[PDB]
Design a protein around this ligand. Structure first.
Ligand SMILES: CC(C)CCC[C@@H](C)[C@H]1CC[C@H]2[C@@H]3CC=C4C[C@@H](OC(=O)CCC(=O)O)CC[C@]4(C)[C@H]3CC[C@]12C
Ligand SMILES: CC(C)CCC[C@@H](C)[C@H]1CC[C@H]2[C@@H]3CC=C4C[C@@H](OC(=O)CCC(=O)O)CC[C@]4(C)[C@H]3CC[C@]12C
Ligand SMILES: CCCCCCCCCC(=O)N(CCO)C[C@@H](O)[C@@H](O)[C@@H](O)[C@@H](O)CO
Ligand SMILES: CCCCCCCCCC(=O)N(CCO)C[C@@H](O)[C@@H](O)[C@@H](O)[C@@H](O)CO
Ligand SMILES: Cc1cc(N2CCNCC2)nc2ccccc12
Ligand code: NA
Ligand code: NA
Length: 283
């Protein structure tokens, strides 16, 4: 009865989780393989896209599988170390994603307002340093505070969860919830929106239709990212002030909306003929 109902749900979620993993992994391997095998797609801007595919690949290979086992089985099967590692990797990927989008927006702004200054400043070696710096900074604000337990709360509910090896809820204190959100998400979001609007304005004051079509693609990956993660991070803050005003399962839904973003960019890149061709060829 209870057991048949469990077996039905377990089986069904496991397939659905498999699908989501497969979509995230296939899509982002395709983006990486496409850019890595097509001279025409080997632009500096696409180096930044590859970094973003790596973030999403890590979400499909490590973040989502582990979270799937949690949703499907109803406890954490892997112990407390792996629970902390997993949470770290989760925070890392979101931070790395939005910081990279931020860089992309700035890269385009420099390209569009000062194409010559850009041509000579911006090389492959620098693109590389930029990408490493973004991962450095993301690692710094993800791993270290989590491995220093700066996120832990005194509350008994929180304490219940920490001793329990089957609980891997990321139940944090309020200072971390606000700090972490601002540092990992809100600040880079405001930077990206500010620079993205300026790129819009400069594009309006301006082969042109083709360039703009690629800008619009970047604009779409930025907007869909915002739509997918903003709700989660708004709710994160709201909870700090009032635990009860937003229902818990919708806090979970918004988290999964966020994870689902990692499957979206490869689809969105099908707006481009060059990507579409390299995808067909590769498959
Ligand atoms: C488990 C967690 C900690 C995974 C962390 C992996 C990172 C170290 C990955 C994610 C994105 C990767 C980057 C994505 C893309 C590139 C472009 C790649 O090729 C080039 O930029 C041109 C170099 C050349 O022409 O040889 C150089 C490595 C680099 C920076 C990668 C270096 C390794 C990065 C930072
Ligand atoms: C490192 C750079 C990128 C960040 C620069 C921003 C900081 C100078 C300021 C801006 C907003 C400030 C935050 C605003 C609100 C809070 C909540 C505050 O204290 C509480 O939340 C008490 C609640 C409780 O524990 O009951 C903790 C510090 C923090 C994150 C502040 C820490 C310092 C912040 C991040
Ligand atoms: C990059 C984010 C860095 C976050 C820095 C948070 C440090 C402050 C942590 C702190 O104040 N507490 C947890 C320190 O263990 C204790 C209180 O929050 C307590 O009332 C619950
Ligand atoms: C999310 C859009 C994803 C659309 C992917 C379909 C490719 C064709 C779309 C296109 O070229 N325009 C729309 C213009
Ligand atoms: C920055 C940040 C991320 C985060 N994720 C864990 C759940 N999966 C989505 C990402 N959770 C946080 C919780 C508190 C503060 C900051 C967080
Ligand atoms: Na992402
Ligand atoms: Na625990």
């Amino acid at each position: 009865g209870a057991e048949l109902l469990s077996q039905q749900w377990e089986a069904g979620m496991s397939l659905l989780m498999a699908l989501v993993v497969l979509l995230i992994v296939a899509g982002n391997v395709l983006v990486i393989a496409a850019i890595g095998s097509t001279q025409r797609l080997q632009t500096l801007t696409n180096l930044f896209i590859t970094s973003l595919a790596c973030a999403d690949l890590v979400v499909g290979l490590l973040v989502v599988p582990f979270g799937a086992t949690l949703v499907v089985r109803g406890t954490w099967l892997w112990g407390s170390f792996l629970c902390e590692l997993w949470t770290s990797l989760d925070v890392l990927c979101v931070t790395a994603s939005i910081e990279t989008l931020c860089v992309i927006a700035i890269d385009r702004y420099l390209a569009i307002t000062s194409p010559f200054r850009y041509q000579s400043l911006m090389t492959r070696a620098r693109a590389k340093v930029i990408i490493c710096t973004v991962w450095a900074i993301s690692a710094l604000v993800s791993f270290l505070p989590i491995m220093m337990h700066w996120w832990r709360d005194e509350d008994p509910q929180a304490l219940k969860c920490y001793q329990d090896p089957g609980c891997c809820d990321f139940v944090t204190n309020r200072a971390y919830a606000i700090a972490s959100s601002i540092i990992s998400f809100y600040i880079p979001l405001l930077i990206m929106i500010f620079v993205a609007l300026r790129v819009y304005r400069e594009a309006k004051e301006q082969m042109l239709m083709r360039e703009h079509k690629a800008l619009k693609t970047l604009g779409i990956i930025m907007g869909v990212f915002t739509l997918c993660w903003l709700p989660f991070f708004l709710v994160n803050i709201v909870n700090v002030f009032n635990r009860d005003l937003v229902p818990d399962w919708l806090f979970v839904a918004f988290n999964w909306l966020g994870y689902a973003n990692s499957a979206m960019n490869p689809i969105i890149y099908c707006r481009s003929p060059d990507f579409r061709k390299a995808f067909k060829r590769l498959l």
